[PDB]
Scaffold this active site. Structure first.
Site, PDB file in Angstrom:
ATOM      1  N   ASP A 133      66.456  63.624 -11.391  1.00 36.79           N
ATOM      2  CA  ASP A 133      65.462  64.658 -11.093  1.00 36.79           C
ATOM      3  C   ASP A 133      64.843  65.146 -12.401  1.00 36.79           C
ATOM      4  OD1 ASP A 133      64.044  66.828  -9.660  1.00 36.79           O
ATOM      5  OD2 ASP A 133      65.633  66.657  -8.130  1.00 36.79           O
ATOM      6  N   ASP A 148      59.981  67.060 -10.136  1.00 37.32           N
ATOM      7  CA  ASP A 148      59.968  68.402  -9.545  1.00 37.32           C
ATOM      8  C   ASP A 148      58.619  69.098  -9.768  1.00 37.32           C
ATOM      9  OD1 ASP A 148      61.555  70.620  -8.272  1.00 37.32           O
ATOM     10  OD2 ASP A 148      61.011  71.634 -10.176  1.00 37.32           O
ATOM     11  N   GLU A 207      57.064  65.340  -6.556  1.00 40.17           N
ATOM     12  CA  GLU A 207      57.097  66.415  -5.569  1.00 40.17           C
ATOM     13  C   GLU A 207      55.799  67.199  -5.746  1.00 40.17           C
ATOM     14  OE1 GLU A 207      59.458  69.816  -6.334  1.00 40.17           O
ATOM     15  OE2 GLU A 207      59.742  70.312  -4.227  1.00 40.17           O
ATOM     16  N   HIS A 226      66.907  69.089  -0.245  1.00 38.17           N
ATOM     17  CA  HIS A 226      67.724  70.266  -0.574  1.00 38.17           C
ATOM     18  C   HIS A 226      66.907  71.572  -0.500  1.00 38.17           C
ATOM     19  CE1 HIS A 226      65.353  69.507  -4.022  1.00 38.17           C
ATOM     20  NE2 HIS A 226      65.737  70.659  -4.551  1.00 38.17           N
ATOM     21  N   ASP A 227      65.610  71.449  -0.206  1.00 34.75           N
ATOM     22  CA  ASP A 227      64.703  72.594  -0.077  1.00 34.75           C
ATOM     23  C   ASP A 227      64.307  72.851   1.378  1.00 34.75           C
ATOM     24  OD1 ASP A 227      64.490  73.112  -2.869  1.00 34.75           O
ATOM     25  OD2 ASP A 227      62.876  71.617  -3.059  1.00 34.75           O
TER      26      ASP A 227
END
Ligand SMILES: [Ca+2]
Length: 586
Positions: A104, A212, A274, A348-349
């Site tokens: 990430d 991210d 993302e 995870h969000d």
């Protein structure tokens, strides 16, 4: 398939990715935190599921103010997770199992504990001052408190600025107070970011990066006050001035070139951005192979359904068509191009997909979990499965607000309390929403067994970092599901086998067309690959639902579905409750 450049195979197009949340996957030493040895011990499980690649959420040295997305050192593993050597061993173990490894890449911002920021904040005159965004107060209010430079809202609620007492200036943090945004306008900063966050990991054998909020690096000059679009909020979305800004493609091209020039062994690196929100043209500028930016991106429209555009934690009604269209936004734009897409419902969000888009009742959680698997199995793009999704994990129920760990909940709660009062309609609406939408529904420990009280995530004497979902007691756990031939886990194994066996039209299929788009129950579509046609009929309801196959003939064979294979009448044109079917014609 020749007028469809998107069909050109690549490892990362047809790889199924499994996303691991390191705090919550597997604890190997009973401290209640997942760790790298824990992950290593479960790689065989991930391979057996059918995953081709793993993406691990941030495991770098971090105060955990945003559970790893606040990074204090890009080049050091957080000691609680293990050592750098543990990580290198994990990467090697993943590779020796024949799986790819992505990390990430979180470089919109770093932790205020990062040495870069410790230096930056120390004075107004140091070499790293403008590696972040520093601005004086706009003025002082009637109570004598400094007023922030503009009206921008943090992603987690409240102002997007934090005051520094020492240097008497505010710094920008779109996320939590200890996530200062990096200033990409500073070329030295960009170069340092590439060396530390990117080059280090390329040198240590990663196959790619999940990037991210990659769409946030370019801020519009002047950081102007944002439009007052929310008349019941002090602070306003900064999107017009921070999302897909004027230098964003320049920055992504530059980073892409850095990566190309840094790889030492000619291997093919995937980047998944993302990006949050983007027009189809913007998506093309990002993912067209000829642009040399990203391999693919995440777009949030499908995970935003049922939430207000003004505030994620205010629920609004939606119908099936809204979700159909939002899902199709991920992939329709690539048709007849050299772009590529992602397909996912969980990360995870996000809350759990069965709760959101199926029916998590004891009656329907298994069949609707399988229905979602049938849907995803058939869609074009790089497929992602999030830890626990393969178990048919569901949202937790009846948690008081004080039980939630997430800074996103804590900060939004406090902002609402301050602006509207703790006992207010605004708070009531927020509390209603968190029960459905909170990121924490993704973050409870992975359920390996029914063992009390920690479900095999840790030994029975440990205190997990975050509470277990009670669902582990209802048979939602690895041990129980392996043994149940009818389980969601065993179904996901089937779905991945089906997808791979038919990868030309499932992974690489094109000319996606909706059938009966407005239908509030039936999700139906066709896709093509040369002479082949895939037809899906998916019943998102507890009612029986009719369907038609366009240009129906004897060539359409039932190839996959969630009702018992031996008990399905392929010639029938009514779906049972929560039934899904994939037909393929040659
Ligand atoms: Ca541990």
């Amino acid at each position: 398939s020749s007028a469809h450049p998107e069909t050109e195979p690549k490892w990362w197009k047809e790889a199924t990715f499994y996303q691991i949340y390191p705090a919550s996957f597997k604890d190997s030493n009973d401290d209640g935190w997942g760790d790298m040895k824990g992950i290593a011990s479960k790689l065989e499980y991930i391979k057996e599921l059918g995953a081709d690649a793993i993406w691990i959420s941030p495991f770098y040295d971090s105060p955990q103010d945003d559970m790893g997305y606040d990074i204090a050192n890009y080049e050091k593993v957080w000691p609680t997770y293990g050592t750098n050597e543990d990580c290198f061993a994990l990467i090697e173990k993943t590779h020796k199992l024949g799986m790819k490894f992505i990390t990430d890449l979180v470089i919109n911002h770093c932790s205020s504990e990062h040495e870069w920021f410790k230096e930056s904040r120390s004075s107004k005159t140091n070499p790293k001052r403008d590696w972040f965004f520093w601005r004086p107060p706009k003025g002082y209010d009637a109570e004598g408190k400094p007023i922030p430079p503009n009206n921008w809202k943090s992603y987690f609620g409240g102002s997007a600025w934090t005051f520094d007492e020492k240097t008497q200036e505010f710094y920008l943090r779109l996320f939590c107070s200890t996530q200062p945004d990096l200033n990409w306008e500073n070329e030295d900063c960009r170069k340092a970011i590439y060396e530390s966050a990117v080059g280090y990991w390329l040198d240590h054998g990663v196959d790619g990066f999940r990037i991210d909020v990659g769409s946030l690096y370019s801020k519009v000059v002047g950081l102007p006050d944002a439009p007052v679009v929310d008349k019941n909020s002090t602070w306003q979305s900064s999107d017009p001035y921070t999302l897909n800004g004027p230098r964003i493609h320049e920055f992504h091209q530059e980073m892409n070139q850095f990566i190309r020039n840094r790889v030492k062994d000619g291997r093919e690196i995937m980047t998944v951005g993302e990006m949050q929100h983007a027009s189809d043209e913007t998506k093309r500028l990002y993912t067209s192979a000829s642009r040399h930016e990203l391999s693919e991106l995440f777009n949030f429209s499908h995970t935003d359904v049922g939430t207000s555009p003004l505030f994620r934690y205010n629920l609004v009604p939606f119908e099936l068509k809204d979700w159909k269209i939002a899902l199709a936004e991920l992939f329709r734009y690539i048709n007849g191009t050299d772009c590529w897409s992602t397909i996912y419902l969980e990360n995870h969000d996000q809350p759990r997909s069965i709760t959101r888009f199926g029916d998590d009742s004891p009656k329907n959680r298994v069949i609707s979990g399988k229905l979602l698997s049938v849907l995803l199995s058939a869609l074009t793009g790089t497929l992602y499965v999030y830890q626990g999704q393969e178990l048919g994990q569901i949202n937790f129920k009846n948690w008081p607000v004080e039980k939630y760990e997430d800074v996103e909940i804590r900060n939004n709660y406090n902002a609402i309390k301050e602006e509207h009062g703790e006992n207010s309609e605004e708070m009531k609406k927020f509390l209603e929403a968190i029960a459905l939408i909170s990121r924490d529904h993704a973050r409870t420990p992975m359920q390996w067994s029914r063992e009390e009280p920690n479900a095999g995530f840790s030994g029975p004497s440990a205190k997990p970092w975050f509470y277990l979902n009670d669902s582990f007691r209802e048979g939602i756990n690895v041990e129980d599901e392996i043994k149940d031939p009818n389980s969601v886990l065993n179904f996901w194994k089937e779905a991945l086998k089906f997808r791979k066996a038919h990868k030309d039209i499932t992974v690489y299929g094109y000319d996606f067309e909706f059938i009966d788009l407005d239908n509030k129950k039936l999700f139906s579509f066709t896709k093509k690959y040369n002479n082949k046609t895939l037809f899906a009929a998916l019943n998102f309801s507890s009612d029986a639902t009719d369907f038609k196959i366009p240009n129906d003939d004897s060539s359409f064979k039932l190839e996959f579905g969630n009702y018992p294979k031996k008990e399905v009448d392929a010639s029938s044109r009514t779906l049972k409750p929560w039934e899904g079917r994939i037909y393929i014609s040659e």
